[PDB]
Amino acid sequence: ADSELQLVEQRIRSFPDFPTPGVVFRDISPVLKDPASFRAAIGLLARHLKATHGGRIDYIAGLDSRGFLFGPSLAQELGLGCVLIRKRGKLPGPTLWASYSLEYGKAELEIQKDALEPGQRVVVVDDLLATGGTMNAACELLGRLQAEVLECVSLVELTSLKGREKLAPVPGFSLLQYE
Amino acid sequence: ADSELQLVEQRIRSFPDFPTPGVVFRDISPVLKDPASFRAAIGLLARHLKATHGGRIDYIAGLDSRGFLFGPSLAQELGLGCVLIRKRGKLPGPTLWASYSKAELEIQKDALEPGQRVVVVDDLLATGGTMNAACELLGRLQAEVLECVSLVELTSLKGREKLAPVPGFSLLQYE
Numbered sequence: 001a002d003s004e005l006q007l008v009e010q011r012i013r014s015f016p017d018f019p020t021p022g023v024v025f026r027d028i029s030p031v032l033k034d035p036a037s038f039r040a041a042i043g044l045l046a047r048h049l050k051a052t053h054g055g056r057i058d059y060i061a062g063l064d065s066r067g068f069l070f071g072p073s074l075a076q077e078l079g080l081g082c083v084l085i086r087k088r089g090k091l092p093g094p095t096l097w098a099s100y101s102l103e104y105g106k107a108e109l110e111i112q113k114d115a116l117e118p119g120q121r122v123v124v125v126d127d128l129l130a131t132g133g134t135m136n137a138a139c140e141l142l143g144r145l146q147a148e149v150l151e152c153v154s155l156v157e158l159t160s161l162k163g164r165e166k167l168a169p170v171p172g173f174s175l176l177q178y179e
Numbered sequence: 180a181d182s183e184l185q186l187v188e189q190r191i192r193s194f195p196d197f198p199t200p201g202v203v204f205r206d207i208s209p210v211l212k213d214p215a216s217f218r219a220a221i222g223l224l225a226r227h228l229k230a231t232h233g234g235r236i237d238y239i240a241g242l243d244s245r246g247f248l249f250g251p252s253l254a255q256e257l258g259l260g261c262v263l264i265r266k267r268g269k270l271p272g273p274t275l276w277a278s279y280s281k282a283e284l285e286i287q288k289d290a291l292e293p294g295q296r297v298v299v300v301d302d303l304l305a306t307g308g309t310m311n312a313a314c315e316l317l318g319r320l321q322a323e324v325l326e327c328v329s330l331v332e333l334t335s336l337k338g339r340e341k342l343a344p345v346p347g348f349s350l351l352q353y354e
């Protein structure tokens with residue numbers, strides 16, 4: 001490509017009618033497969049977070065499961081640790097949990113009770129912002145641990161699903177937007 | 180690196196009776212939470228791979244889902260891309276899938292080209308059923324799986340014997 005953003009944008013692959021007829025799926029797989037594209041993606045997110053919070057972030061919180069692909073790498077780039085917010089049942093020890101809407105039904109996310117001490121400043125990371133269901137659940141869980149969620153970031157945002165407005169008061173950032 | 184390995188081992192947390200009674204769960208969560216520990220883990224894996232394969236690796240393959248935590252970072256450290264092996268139904272487009280004792284894994288049709296050399300990564304190696312199924316899927320794309328690597332191996336479950344002739348490497352071992 002050329003610029004870093006187009007190095008990422010050219011690696012987001014479109015699949016119409018997946019998983020259901022009418023929708024257009026955005027596949028982030030080529031970004032991970034091309035090391036130059038992955039590097040560019042992490043760098044863009046890292047520079048945004050460094051410029052925005054001035055190095056004053058305590059942890060990245062990565063979302064099960066595609067957020068796991070970006071969370072640790074972004075954390076490492078910023079010199080920060082990464083905490084995990086997982087689907088219900090995946091984490092050992094005492095947990096807090098929260099429900100959210102998934103397709104035609106309901107699901108739950110969880111976090112370990114000792115994942116954070118009170119007052120930690122945290123950025124939530126996932127690959128794609130759609131309905132905002134999981135990010136909303138994530139913010140609720142972090143709040144119960146008395147964390148300060150600085151913002152939610154993703155590579156892709158699907159604007160027609162209005163995920164960003166649901167996250168308020170928490171600000172959202174995304175590298176790329178489609179419907 | 181004894182000091183680096185200690186940084187990883189100190190962070191591994193064990194929980195008795197999870198997910199079921201009698202089973203000891205090895206939790207790699209604190210490794211991710213401590214940036215120095217995460218750096219150490221990625222560095223140890225990368226150094227092993229370079230000391231064993233040099234630059235003769237094309238891709239890292241990360242396993243859904245805990246393998247996703249280490250795959251990209253390890254690939255990045257080696258200057259390599261990362262391909263995904265997911266639970267069935269997650270990936271768009273043409274796919275190859277398979278079952279194992281049931282559980283199902285899947286890969287995209289164009290994930291790799293014939294002869295390309297891959298290292299598989301997951302957080303923990305137990306019976307080896309998961310990693311073996313990943314290897315078999317990759318085999319159906321005519322990839323050469325050089326090795327499977329993980330942070331932890333549970334030695335008494337004989338995962339490496341299941342993986343053979345694909346070699347397995349782990350930073351830490353427990354019964």
Ligand SMILES: Nc1ncnc2c1ncn2[C@@H]1O[C@H](COP(=O)(O)O)[C@@H](O)[C@H]1O
Binds near residue numbers: 202206301338
């Ligand atoms: N005692 C354990 N502690 C943490 N993860 C485990 C444990 N036993 C099996 N797993 C998970 O099971 C998968 C591999 O198991 P296997 O296919 O039997 O080699 C990986 O996702 C592992 O993290």
